[PDB]
Amino acid sequence: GGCTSMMNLVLCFTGFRKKEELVRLVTLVHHMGGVIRKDFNSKVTHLVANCTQGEKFRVAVSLGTPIMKPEWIYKAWERRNEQDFYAAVDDFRNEFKVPPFQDCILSFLGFSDEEKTNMEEMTEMQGGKYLPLGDERCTHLVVEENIVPFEPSKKLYVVKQEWFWGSIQMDARAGETMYLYSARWQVAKELYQTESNYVNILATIIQLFQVPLEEEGQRGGPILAPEEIKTIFGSIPDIFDVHTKIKDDLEDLISIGDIFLKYSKDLVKTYPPFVNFFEMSKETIIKCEKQKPRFHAFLKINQAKPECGRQSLVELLIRPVQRLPSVALLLNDLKKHTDKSTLEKAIGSLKEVMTHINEDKRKTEAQKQIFDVVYEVDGCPANLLSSHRSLVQRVETISLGEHPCDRGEQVTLFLFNDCLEIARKRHPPASLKHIHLMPLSQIKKVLDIRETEDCHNAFALLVRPPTEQANVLLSFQMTSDELPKENWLKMLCRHVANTICKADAENLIYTADPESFE
Structure with a gap:
């Protein structure tokens, strides 16, 4: 032998x-x-x-x-x-x-001095050497060119950022040449589309992260120990299992409560073990991202893929933590906008599962701000407070057009991570009057309006409420000087996408100018 x-x-x-x-x-x-x-x-x-x-x-x-x-x-x-x-x-x-990087002389541009410092430590960690940008003695030029010349030397390799990370993950020099250069019926399909987008997001987590870390025969050996893979992902595949059942039955239905009443037994099993340890998941990812550089490259490669919508693994794991509150919010806006007994049975058991969520101190601070809105807004729906959501942004606004309130009416908007509360000023307790609590799923498109000075700081939202069976414009004028209009339109479209369960939020912004006046 x-x-x-x-x-x-x-x-x-x-x-x-x-x-x-x-x-x-x-x-x-x-x-x-x-x-x-x-x-x-x-x-x-x-x-x-x-x-x-x-x-x-x-x-x-x-x-x-x-x-x-x-x-x-x-x-x-x-x-x-x-x-x-x-x-x-x-x-x-x-x-x-x-x-x-044996016999490789590298050079980097397009990265911060803290990112460039790492990419030079690792270069010498992989047996290579780095020379200042532009040098004639360079073999490779690596650049995060999504930012997109000097040193157009002919022999040198001008490779994409992936060639660098790909070589650290595989623990072998990557090939350069591939990296060079019916009123309640409207609420139903809404709940369908978010459940199907939710499983696609879960499928993305499992197939672009978990499964590749669990594969046998990885180039350069296993990236992560089996224990630290279980800590990070946990019962995500199990969560994926229950919801794809929920998505299946819901799809062929096109009593909804019974659908959720059934899997409620499954629901309580899968979610607490993941949600409660979600902090440790975030710790492990950041720890391994730092200590284990092969895993650092793994995240650099995968998060750069369009199926991530420029979302981190961490902020992709946030969707299950926030999924069940959005379901309840669509369930309340379904029962009332509709035997309605079956539905009310499901909402109660649904908030019974949130009991098992041991609450972070960041959750007890978040609800302190949710309560400040229910206090101030007369007729603000109670179920807004019951869940584990958070206030994202308050924006003072003046209404335009027939909807949602009389034209010229002063309005305040409250952005939560999964809904928009719209409050009129009245005709400190009850300073505002409730108008509509809109699940962010009902916003079909967001509109930016150019500064013609025919109208100043204007925007609009394309919404499909279950009431009018068509799209309707909600025109608004920002009076809040706290934030630029685009920083908040970006804040709007991010959180709209986060509850639609589409990792790409840029498919929502549009700019126009004709319809609004003054």
């Missing part, structure tokens, strides 16, 4: 000028049971490289085939008669891989 120490391996060599060293290596490989090809095909299992950047080297990088140091053969020969010793096992073999 030493003649089988390299058995079934196909080795190829590159960069050995002294033919006497090569013969010593070839001899040891044959005696350990490997075979050797002169030329490189897809069958070679390991390239043994004495030099980077040749023909065999560049091809091997493309195919992801391992690139080993000559010392690998010598240490394997030493340990070749240990019991069950096999030279290809990663834990023995990882130590002898050619480092990813």
Whole structure:
């Protein structure tokens, strides 16, 4: 079992000028049971490289085939008669891989001095070196070019940011050439569309993060220990299981309470174990993001994908923490806008599950601000307070157009993370009068209006309330100098998307100018 120490391996060599060293290596490989090809095909299992950047080297990088140091053969020969010793096992073999940035001179622009500092620590951590931008002695230029020249030297590689992170994750030099250069019926389909968007977001978490970290045979070995994967994700697949059932039954229905009354038994099982430890999840991710740089690259690569909508893994995990309150909010606006007994049974059990949520001190501060609105707004719906939501922004506004209140009427808007409270001034307790508590799901589009000075600081919302069976414009004029109109229109569209369960919020902003006056 030493003649089988390299058995079934196909080795190829590159960069050995002294033919006497090569013969010593070839001899040891044959005696350990490997075979050797002169030329490189897809069958070679390991390239043994004495030099980077040749023909065999560049091809091997493309195919992801391992690139080993000559010392690998010598240490394997030493340990070749240990019991069950096999030279290809990663834990023995990882130590002898050619480092990813071996003989690589890198250069970075488009990153803060704290981000650039990391990308230079890691460069030398991966056996590379970095020279100041523009240098003639550079082999690679790496730039977060989503910010999108100097140093157009012909030999150097101008690679996308992914080439850098991809090389740290795989723990091997990535290939450059791929990185270069019917009134209550309206409430029903609304609850359908958010449940289907919710499972797609869950499916995104499971398939772009959890499953890849659980796969066997990851390049460079496992990124995360099995314990620290369970802590982060926990019962997300189980949550995905219950809601896709909820989405299924709801879809073919097109009593709703019974639908939720059934899975309520399932609901209480899955959510508390994840929600209550959600803080530890956020801790572990940030800890591993710092301590474990392969996992840092993993997050850099995956969060850059359009299926994330420029959302972090963390702020993608927030959707389940906030999902059930939005369901209840659509359930209340469904029962009243409609045997209605079945529905009222579900809402009660739904807030019975929120009992199991041990509350952070940041949750007891959040509700202190929710109460300040129910106190001030006469007729403000009570269920606004019952849930675990938070006030995002208060904006003083003057109404325009017939809706939602008389034209010229002074209005105050309260943005919560999953609903918009609209309060009129009256014709400190009851300073404002309630008009409408709108689930953010009912906002179909947000409109920016240009500063023609025919109208100043104007915007509008395209909403589909279950009442009028069509879209309606809600025109408004900002009087709040606290925030620019765009910073709040961005704040609006983010949180509108967060409760629609679409990670991309930029599909909501539109700019126009004709309809509004003064």
